[PDB]
Amino acid sequence: QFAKPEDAVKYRQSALTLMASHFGRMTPVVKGQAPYDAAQIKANVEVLKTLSALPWAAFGPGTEGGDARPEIWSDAASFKQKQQAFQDNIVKLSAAADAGDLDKLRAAFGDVGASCKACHDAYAKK
Amino acid sequence: QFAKPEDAVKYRQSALTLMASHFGRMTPVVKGQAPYDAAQIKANVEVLKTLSALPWAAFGPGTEGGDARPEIWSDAASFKQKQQAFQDNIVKLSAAADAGDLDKLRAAFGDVGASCKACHDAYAKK
Ligand code: HEC
Ligand code: HEC
Known part of the structure; x- marks a missing residue:
């Protein structure tokens, strides 16, 4: 879908920025600093589910460039x-959000964040 | 969800960039230059549906700034x-994609593009 490889760069940077906002905006809820509204979180995690699938095709074959470390393409496997x-x-986080339990949300949010x-740590420039 | 208003700027620019890629990548299909695969387009329009809802909250109250024209906030209505x-x-485009007919896709794609x-024309800087 990209006319030139730089268009893939701009797409993936945008996908990561969004996806990220949709993860990080839940941090105060997970920590108990903001209230837990199960329906609110279920809806947000549905948006995150969609976004979380998007960056990777734009790091695929022929998309070399940008700021990221070159092992994305030299070690594609x-x-x-x-x-x-x-x-x-992410599938585990969707299950926790759909169940509507804060304990399960906390555990799955930690699982996602570690990933x-x-x-x-491996693939972004230092 | 934004620590400072500049975070809203970066979010909405990313949302518009993505959303846009998901619209424009269908242009060759609408024109007949690429083949029409109904399932492919239905799946892509589901992604566009999600993305198309995202920029607007980040142009809401207190998000003044960036490059866009100031009437976004001075004429919010x-x-x-x-x-x-x-x-x-977008709802009409989802209906066309779900129906799996290229004629309806062409018409709804034109409707979206005009909007x-x-x-x-009104709100981006010149
Ligand atoms: C590997 C399979 C990744 C996963 C899983 C996650 N991210 Fe990532 N991220 C990855 C790369 C290779 C890069 C570098 C891109 C670059 O611009 O050089 C990034 C970068 C980000 C960024 C910055 C994007 C920007 O436009 O500057 C953010 C905000 C980010 N990553 C966040 C993020 C989150 C919250 C993740 C889990 C929910 C996540 N990433 C996973 C590779 C990978
Ligand atoms: C008003 C309600 C909008 C609708 C509908 C669409 N767009 Fe738009 N767009 C809007 C503004 C106010 C701006 C300026 C933002 C800025 O960066 O100053 C834009 C900008 C874009 C961009 C550029 C984004 C960037 O990061 O530089 C693109 C690629 C874009 N718009 C595309 C786009 C598409 C394809 C739309 C329909 C599918 C669409 N926009 C609708 C406001 C509005």
């Missing part, structure tokens, strides 16, 4: 592993 | 009108 892990953690951190 | 129009056109253009 290993970037897909970190991706599978993250997308599986965010893992990929960033 | 009139920006919401152009928004209602766009979101209603994209209208808001940009």
Whole structure:
């Protein structure tokens, strides 16, 4: 869907920015600093589910460039592993949000956050 | 969800960039230059449906700034009108995509595109 590889760069940066806002905006709820409204969180996690699927195609074949570390493309199998892990953690977060229990939300949110951190430690520039 | 108003700016720019890629990537299909796969388009329009709801809250009260024209906030009622129009056109595009007919897709895609253009003509900087 990208006329030139730089268009893939701009797309994935935007996808990560959004996806991220939709994860991080729940931090005060998970910590108990903001109230837990099960319906609010269920709706937000549905948006995060959609967004969480979007960056990865724009890091695929022929999208070399941008600021990210080059092992995304030179070790493509290993970037897909970190991706599978993250997308599986998102499914667990959707289940917690759909159940409407804050304890399960806290646990799944931690699971997702650790998988965010893992990929960033390996593949973002230092 | 934004720590400072600049975070709303970065969010809405990203939302518009994505949402836009998901609309514009269908142009070759609408024109007949790429093949029409009803299931492919239905899935893409579901992603566009989600994205199309996201920019507007980040142009709401207290989000003044960025590059956009100031009438977004000084004439907030009139920006919401152009928004209602766009979101209603998106519902028509979802119906066309779910029906799986290229003729209806072409018509609804034109309807959406005109509503994209209208808001940009009024509210983006020149
Ligand atoms: C690997 C499979 C990733 C997963 C899982 C997550 N992120 Fe990530 N992220 C990844 C890369 C390779 C980069 C570098 C992109 C670049 O601009 O060089 C990023 C970057 C981000 C950013 C910054 C984006 C920007 O436009 O500057 C954010 C805000 C971000 N990542 C957040 C984030 C969150 C919250 C995640 C889990 C919910 C997450 N990322 C997962 C790779 C990967
Ligand atoms: C008014 C209710 C809008 C509707 C409907 C659409 N867009 Fe728009 N768009 C709007 C504003 C006020 C701006 C300016 C933002 C800025 O950065 O100053 C934009 C901008 C865009 C952009 C550029 C974003 C960027 O990061 O530079 C794009 C790619 C864009 N708009 C596309 C777009 C599409 C495809 C639309 C219909 C599917 C659409 N916009 C609708 C306001 C409004």
